[PDB]
Amino acid sequence: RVVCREASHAGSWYTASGPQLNAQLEGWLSQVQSTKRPARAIIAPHAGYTYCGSCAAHAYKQVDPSITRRIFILGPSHHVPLSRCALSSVDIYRTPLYDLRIDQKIYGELWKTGMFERMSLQTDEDEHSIEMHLPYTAKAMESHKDEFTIIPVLVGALSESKEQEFGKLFSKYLADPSNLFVVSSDFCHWGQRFRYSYYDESQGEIYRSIEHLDKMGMSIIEQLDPVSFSNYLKKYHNTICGRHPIGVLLNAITELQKNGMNMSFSFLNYAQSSQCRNWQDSSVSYAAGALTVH
Ligand SMILES: N[C@@H](CCC(=O)N[C@@H](CS)C(=O)NCC(=O)O)C(=O)O
Numbered sequence: 001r002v003v004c005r006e007a008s009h010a011g012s013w014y015t016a017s018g019p020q021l022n023a024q025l026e027g028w029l030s031q032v033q034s035t036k037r038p039a040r041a042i043i044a045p046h047a048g049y050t051y052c053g054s055c056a057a058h059a060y061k062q063v064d065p066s067i068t069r070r071i072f073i074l075g076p077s078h079h080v081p082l083s084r085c086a087l088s089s090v091d092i093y094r095t096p097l098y099d100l101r102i103d104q105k106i107y108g109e110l111w112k113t114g115m116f117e118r119m120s121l122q123t124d125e126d127e128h129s130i131e132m133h134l135p136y137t138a139k140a141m142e143s144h145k146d147e148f149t150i151i152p153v154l155v156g157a158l159s160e161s162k163e164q165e166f167g168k169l170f171s172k173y174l175a176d177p178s179n180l181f182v183v184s185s186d187f188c189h190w191g192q193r194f195r196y197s198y199y200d201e202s203q204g205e206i207y208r209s210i211e212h213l214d215k216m217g218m219s220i221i222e223q224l225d226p227v228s229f230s231n232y233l234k235k236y237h238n239t240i241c242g243r244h245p246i247g248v249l250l251n252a253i254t255e256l257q258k259n260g261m262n263m264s265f266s267f268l269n270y271a272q273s274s275q276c277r278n279w280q281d282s283s284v285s286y287a288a289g290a291l292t293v294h
Pocket residue numbers: 012013046047048049051186189241273284
């Protein structure tokens with residue numbers, strides 16, 4: 001059997017040289033002042049680092065490496081038809097900084113729930129939405145590099161009921177302060193290439209309309225309300241890539257609220273790959289945010 005998932009997008013989605021990538025991540029993180037430590041969950045983009053790395057630093061700076069010991073990474077599936085969630089078949093996720101080990105105890109528990117399928121190595125390596133969080137996770141945790149594990153989870157095209165079921169499942173881990181949930185998503189993909197041209201002309205320029213649409217969704221997430229987030233998706237069909245991981249996170253949050261826990265979510269940075277001004281333009285939006293639980 002193969003023990004390691006290769007960093008199959010190193011060199012094309014981020015720098016393949018370990019030292020250079022470490023330096024890039026350090027610069028981005030050094031631009032950010034921590035305000036939401038110790039983050040129990042984060043939302044972070046999964047585009048190429050040239051496009052979204054400085055944005056993603058706003059989420060990853062909120063991780064406290066002396067507290068966090070187990071990092072779940074929930075990323076949407078881009079290439080395979082998947083109606084549930086899937087777990088990796090390997091034991092180690094390689095990165096150019098250092099290699100990350102999967103938490104065997106949690107993987108066994110998750111598998112024993114019976115709600116997960118096993119993703120093949122090819123499916124595992126083909127997807128990028130989890131991989132793009134490995135370098136940043138490795139960088140954020142480096143002061144404790146030998147004392148943490150990861151729990152990779154591929155999230156498919158979940159129904160609403162599956163979002164609720166998986167939220168309930170993951171809530172027991174979300175309530176543990178040693179755990180961190182990384183929820184991978186980009187926001188609005190606007191343009192004819194994405195077959196998405198929603199435009200609110202009360203907002204002015206197209207990029208301002210995109211910013212307004214994205215921030216309506218972001219505010220709804222800050223309301224910790226999965227039903228309202230679902231209604232927002234049904235109303236505008238915003239091209240939020242990781243809407244299913246986000247729905248899982250929101251349902252998990254509502255499970256913890258029904259158990260006495262107090263929580264708050266704040267988005268800390270918003271960016272667009274470019275500023276659309278005409279109908280032939282296209283852009284992708286990135287947003288970084290953090291959930292703290294007391
Ligand atoms: N270099 C990689 C990544 C390129 C990239 O990051 N593109 C931007 C669009 S400007 C992006 O946001 N991709 C992820 C997405 O569309 O959600 C590739 O060739 O696909």
